[model samples]
Target: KKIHINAFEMNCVGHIAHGLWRHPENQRHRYTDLNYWTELAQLLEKGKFDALFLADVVGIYDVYRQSRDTAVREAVQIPVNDPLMLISAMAYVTKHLAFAVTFSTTYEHPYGHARRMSTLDHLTKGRIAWNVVTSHLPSADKNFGIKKILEHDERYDLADEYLEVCYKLWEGSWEDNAVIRDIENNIYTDPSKVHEINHSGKYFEVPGPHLCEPSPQRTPVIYQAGMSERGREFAAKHAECVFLGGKDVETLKFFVDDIRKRAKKYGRNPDHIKMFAGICVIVGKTHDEAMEKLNSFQKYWSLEGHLAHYGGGTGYDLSKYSSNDYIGSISVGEIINNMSKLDGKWFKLSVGTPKKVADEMQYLVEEAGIDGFNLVQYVSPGTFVDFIELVVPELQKRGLYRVDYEEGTYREKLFGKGNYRLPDDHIAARYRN
Candidate 1:
């Protein structure tokens, strides 16, 4: 099977790499401008990339330091703009590229969210996906006027109903031939085919018919990223593709196997859910040249800035502790529990040639059975430029990466011909005719 690759991106100066935007070639400061997105769309098409996965969050990362000061200073995913607004401009620049935009299922009303996604699916001509997330930060709950926080597992329970409402709106509301436009009878839509979905659940009460007609893919392809046990179960039930963040082969294999087993129990085909992991690559002509490149990039790795993001992501203020203290003793909350996965491990490209990077990736794919990766960035445009110019060729030579763009919508490209929508066995299909 061909590899499924996505350019994991966020609308900020420095997304994962904290302070690397200061690199000489980094152009992340241009994110607020239209040209930046159009240029990125053109470049991704040039590289034959499949999709640009845009991530977002509703509130500031204030869990660290109990203040947003450090997070604001480091530009750690705050000061971010809406990802949905940029899609039409980017879509105008390219024909086949896909967009997957992140949105929370907890705060937004299902009816409104469903309509917006349908409009986007129509505008993008079926080249759109939704990354479903239940809000993770405490600050977000407060911002949304939530009275009390649902426990981690209960949040997934809420998401289950959120998706059900969306499925009813996207799949059950309209029939295939509802829009007849019969001028003779002056009938625009057939009332008999239209139905009201009266839904009532623990977390939501959405009633009646969906407001919009069905778009190309009635339900957008679902993508999810959290990897806790509850998260894995949720993905098995809803996600078409899952994003994973483990560092080593054994750890990744364990995750892939466990999720696949869960998906099987959900009545899904074991091979249907695609698994993608985050990877960073720094490649050059030779080992010495690669080491030189790594040295230059490492000079900008900001410990303070990284810690700020780490604190927000983990909900533990590292600054409150001594420099050499271990994270295990920190009792702040579940945020620290998430970070412990990456606390002791190494994931940087460090000093490696393209061949070496390709070998490492090949090992993960062949042994760990991950489908592909979301390449992390050290600098904005420059990081992607380096991979396109250096490493893509090596992977292509090994028949592990595509050398040309496939002709279809995102789903067809991912799963090939005769498959433009979710299959019959998927949960979403239960709502479809």
Candidate 2:
């Protein structure tokens, strides 16, 4: 029942916060700077955060208004860089901090992607986790050269095969003693210890040994944010860390129960799959001060940006409705208030003093049956710094948050020491020699 707090981030300027990047205090413009990531990593490590969960999309948000103009102007996740590229720089700066980076099973080849993750696992000493995603963007699908994107469940089918291929490479291709730096015979590796995966499936045909040897954790910790029935089933069978989606405690609890029950049927321990809900926090010295800051922030929020973001994610075109009807009498401040006030839409937003924020977070943990959260950011360092300086201590005082990190790889820390590899119950373990 330990609470894991992960800072939610992306390689772009406009993430969940919409158009707040224009705020003078916002330093998100420096996202291209490596120092930005290093500095952020240092702060999170000092604050003892569980991990930094980086979100990514392969293409632009062109679904909104049938064009990508507003998104491009607002910098809504387009012109974004690679999430994996930021990991090594951040990993070198901190010891305990872990990174859960997003990559699509639908886009990249499992073989090359497996090697990339192994490289990260080795470089970070096993602090890497992969957020498995089936590409949802239609534009991304077309750009990847697919004639037509696969249907909803079809993507999951591909993912199942994708994971199967990766598991073989990570777990079965190399033996326990495959590498031996023996001076006597001048042998670096034994040819007999390496084996071909020889996998031929409906979607993939991979034949041979993995490009890289086993990392600290032979497989990187698996993270999936699945919100559909097929997606949930896939998560139950494969995920170690699940990013859950729901709007309230009731809905969140529903999925938590469902996913756990499903896991039990899959012959996997329910507790091993950590559930993380999304949360956004705005804090101040007092309740009034918090409101004041929020009101100030409203000035910079772009209504079109929010609409554009919604269109891309939901595929519901708002432009069909008359602009006057949606934007007419409603004040911009009121719109911002409504969007930010909701719990668990984009993120469950909590605005208050340190004690109040802590109370809200604690209540969610008790009510939703979730293990932790992906903390959404409003302003780069500003948002995270506020939580660390304000809410973190309050949670620590209540003994609901860890003051220090547990030892080992990200998986080991979550599942406990000596569990650096995928547990025997996981589907991936069947591939291990």
Candidate 3:
């Protein structure tokens, strides 16, 4: 297959494509119910999906008008639950469906984070992948008791050191065979084989042997999303999979090429980082049916909510700008700079038929040289169910989608056989010695 498909998901009533919970067919309102995730997990496994990529946010979308009232009213990623809590239940329901859970490094301690991931690694039987994030929300800082927001570049610096500590805990603290039962000695582990990391850095101090022994894939697969210069540089050193954002083939190609170029300079294999773009699909039995479906969805597309999300992500208040002006007119360094990087356009999907959507997506993958897509949902379970029913078979028929899943952890499935762990050239591998 030339494309990878990860069902971009969230543990909440609302995710990126917001306000669609009002749809009669949408089941995302039942997010708190355990059956919701288990059912979705089973569905994705049946579709031979690469992973169910769950996005998380530690804080509210508070940037619009410098308050969270708009987000609260629209349910734009607020009323969210912890994504990590849902993984175990999903794992129990389905085998071979990889779970990529997002967690921000900006707020959590590496020691605790490492232990939690290791626990999931063991519990999921190594099916866990971590989508590392340096949170962009200023509200997240307040929620986490961060007195002030770190500059964007500075946040990446902290993330680099944070991963350094995590690598130490995951790879360096314990030998591969550090645990063994010795009946005569009455010992379960050889203490001498376990070493303390003693990590002390500019932002954090973590001193210890890791709390848990290494699980399969000692360092979980790293996924990152953020296309800033600093973000790309960070991904070059760490991310194995990258979640990218762009509206078209030419734009996505620019991002793919730029990031791959940086990866080479960082002494890492460019191919090691698989890039996925955000896509939304509306499918039906035939071309006309698909067009009708797209028309119906257009009636529900919340442009206001989309703008709120865009504003939140960039920390720019869109309401402040004139309605007629595009977001790039603000000319703020982060806003203009990042948008220009994506071929100077921003909006991704408004509406499209299945063949039309699939054809556009295929062009992006082939022309941009990307590995896959993170298909965003407009109306929660309704959107997903529609795609699986109408579009998956189309992609499969064209030899662009998978027919069966490979059995392994997210990393193993992504890279194929004999690729169960982080590659030797990864930064984490340095800590192994």
Candidate 4:
């Protein structure tokens, strides 16, 4: 099977890697410029990446040390711009480079969000994806005037209803031939062909025809973020792709098997749900050179930055945990010392020569049965350039990665040539007229 890859990013300065953006070689400061995204799109297209996976969060990390100071100072995804706004700019610069943008189901209403996605799909010519996240940010929840937040399990139920409304609008609201642009008769859309969804769920009520005509793919491919019990069921039934997290090969394989098995139970094809792991690669001509680069990242690595992220993200104040106590899998001491370069946090960090990096990727792909890697960047273009120039060629030569760009929408590139729409087994497809 050919390995899929995405350039994982955020609209902020620091993404997964805590403080590497401060590196002199990194151009993260240019995130404010339109040229930065357009130029990056062109380069990724040149490298033949499957997509640029953008992560977003609307809240600040305030739970750390009981304050938002570290988060704000370290730029831990705050002072962030909108991820959706960057798509049209990047889409204009390149073809075949898919944009998988993240958005939350909690704060935003389904009606408005659905229209925005349809617009983007039209603009990207179907090369768009959405990473669904029913976010768990206390700051965001309160900031949006969500007075009473639902329980953890209840939020997934709300997300279920959220997607239900979206599915109805995207798939069932408009017919394939609704838009007829008949210039002679001066009719842009035939009213008879377009119908109102009239969706009334437990949480939401939307009643009307879709605002936009159907894009190439009626519903952009769904990329679900979490993988817990609730997250697994959501991913199995709804997500075309999912982000996987685990400590070891056995752990990863268990998640892969469990999710596919759950998907099969949902009357869906097990192979349809693609699993991806976040991976950080630091590559160089020699092992020593890579180690030197790692040294640089370590020097710039901020433990407080990570502490804030961990505390706010997981609701665990690491300042309270002692060195000997296990926080998740690793001790707080271990997590503090290691910048998740080798292991600890969700991302699997690989450092060394190209062969070594590719070797690490291959083992996980075969052992865990994962479909792809969300390439994490320690530094802006430097990290990506290393992967494309060095590691990509190695994987291609080994017959594990794609060398040439495929034709069609982002969905087609992943599933197959003629598969622009969601597969028949997907729940979203059943919503179609």
Superposed model 4: Cα runs more than 4 Å off? 324-331, 338-342
Per-model C-alpha lDDT, please? 0.79, 0.86, 0.80, 0.86
lDDT string for model 1 (53-144, tens) is 99998878776677888778878887889999988988888888889999998787898989988888888877899999987777788888
Local error of candidate 2 at residue 297 (angstroms): 2.0
- Of the two candidates 1 and 4, the one with more favorable lDDT, higher being better, is 4
Report the alpha-carbon TM-score of model 2 versus the true structure. Answer: 0.94
Q: How accurate is candidate 2 locally (lDDT)?
A: 0.86
Task: Put down candidate 2 lDDT per residue, 316-379, tens digits, no spaces.
Answer: 5666655344443665344445654333254577899999888878887898888998898877
- Misplaced by over 4 Å in model 1 are 323-325, 329-351
Clashes of each: 1, 1, 0, 0
Cα lDDT of model 4 overall?
0.86
lDDT of 3 by residue, 373-394 (tens): 8877766676678777767777
- TM-scores, in order shown? 0.93, 0.94, 0.92, 0.96
Displacement of the residue 184 alpha carbon in candidate 2, Å: 1.8
